[PDB]
């Protein structure tokens, strides 16, 4: 019939990891910065520690099921799980949390390169979970964290198959239908969050009437720093033909081409000398025998 997911699932020991402090919590569940050191192999690894009705744990076990199945650069890496009482999510620590944070905190420091270097790195992630045949349907600045300032990851698959009213595309308001069309429709939702530097969609309206404002024409507004160029590109993302969006592959071509001229496509008041942490960096970075989990592959 289809081809069979040969995805492996690391069992973890509670032992093999050490949680260091809390990163945040508040939704029945909580998430550590830790790290995990694989059992006689030499390294320290950073991980995000996720974490009893039993409805909770088979919604996380499929969340588990979902990330196991993808390996991409700009899709976050799941490491394992970890059956104690409650079952927890190993994932890759994404250091700089996630993308809506980073651009309201550090606002004034990033420069055109940065943006359109996410969008494009947002584009692969999403033009890879097209061929992998899955949908988000979550697609927001929230949920793509920061690796580095240099690199991004998609994550929160706890919706994805194969409510945000404001992200979501008309079809999926009023018919629940979802696509990776539907998809494209929140890139586009998402872009406009980073280009407005974390500003929040339809602000003031609340989604009870949003469906109708879009079913008059009405949509969100060019940001200022952006050229038609790159807002047309938001716009085609929000036709309500959805064959008439653009394909991520597209969008990656388009976002790539741009990024060779960033300072032709997005206008920042002294966008010239805008610095933000680096990997180069001696600060950025105990800590012996630390590898990344992007470097850590199978045992
Ligand atoms: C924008 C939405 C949002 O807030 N996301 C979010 C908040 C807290 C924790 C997580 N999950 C998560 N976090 C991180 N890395 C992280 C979280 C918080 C912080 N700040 C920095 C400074 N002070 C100390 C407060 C904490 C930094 C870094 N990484 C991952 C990696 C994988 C994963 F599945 C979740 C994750 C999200």
């Given at each position: ?15 093999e ?5 809390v ?159 539907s ?47 790159v ?36 206008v ?28 850590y592959?199978?045992?």
């Amino acid at each position: 019939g289809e081809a069979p997911n040969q995805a492996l699932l690391r069992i973890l020991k509670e032992t093999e990891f050490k949680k260091i402090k809390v990163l945040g919590s508040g939704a029945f569940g909580t998430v550590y910065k830790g790290l995990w050191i694989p059992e006689g192999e030499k390294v320290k690894i950073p991980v995000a520690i996720k974490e009893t009705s039993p409805k909770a744990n088979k919604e996380i076990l499929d969340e588990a099921y979902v990330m196991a199945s993808v390996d991409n650069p700009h899709v976050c890496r799941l490491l394992g799980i970890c059956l104690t009482s409650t079952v927890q999510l190993i994932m890759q620590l994404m250091p700089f949390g996630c993308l809506l944070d980073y651009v309201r905190e550090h606002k004034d420091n990033i420069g055109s390169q940065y943006l359109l270097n996410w969008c494009v790195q947002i584009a692969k992630g999403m033009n890879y979970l097209e061929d992998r045949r899955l949908v988000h349907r979550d697609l927001a600045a929230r949920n793509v964290l920061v690796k580095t300032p240099q690199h991004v990851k998609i994550t929160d698959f706890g919706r994805a198959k194969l409510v945000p009213i404001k992200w979501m595309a008309l079809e999926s308001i009023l018919h629940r239908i979802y696509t990776h069309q539907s998809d494209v429709w929140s890139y586009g939702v998402t872009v406009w969050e980073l280009m407005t530097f974390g500003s929040k969609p339809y602000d003031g309206i609340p989604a009870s009437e949003i469906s109708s404002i879009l079913e008059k024409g009405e949509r969100l507004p060019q940001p200022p720093i952006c050229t038609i160029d790159v807002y047309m590109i938001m716009v085609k993302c929000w036709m309500i033909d959805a064959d008439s969006r653009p394909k991520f592959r597209e969008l990656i071509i388009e976002f790539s081409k741009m990024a060779r001229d960033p300072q032709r496509y997005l206008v920042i008041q002294g966008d010239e000398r805008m610095h933000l942490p680096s990997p180069t960096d001696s600060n950025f970075y105990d800590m012996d025998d630390v590898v990344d989990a992007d470097e850590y592959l199978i045992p």
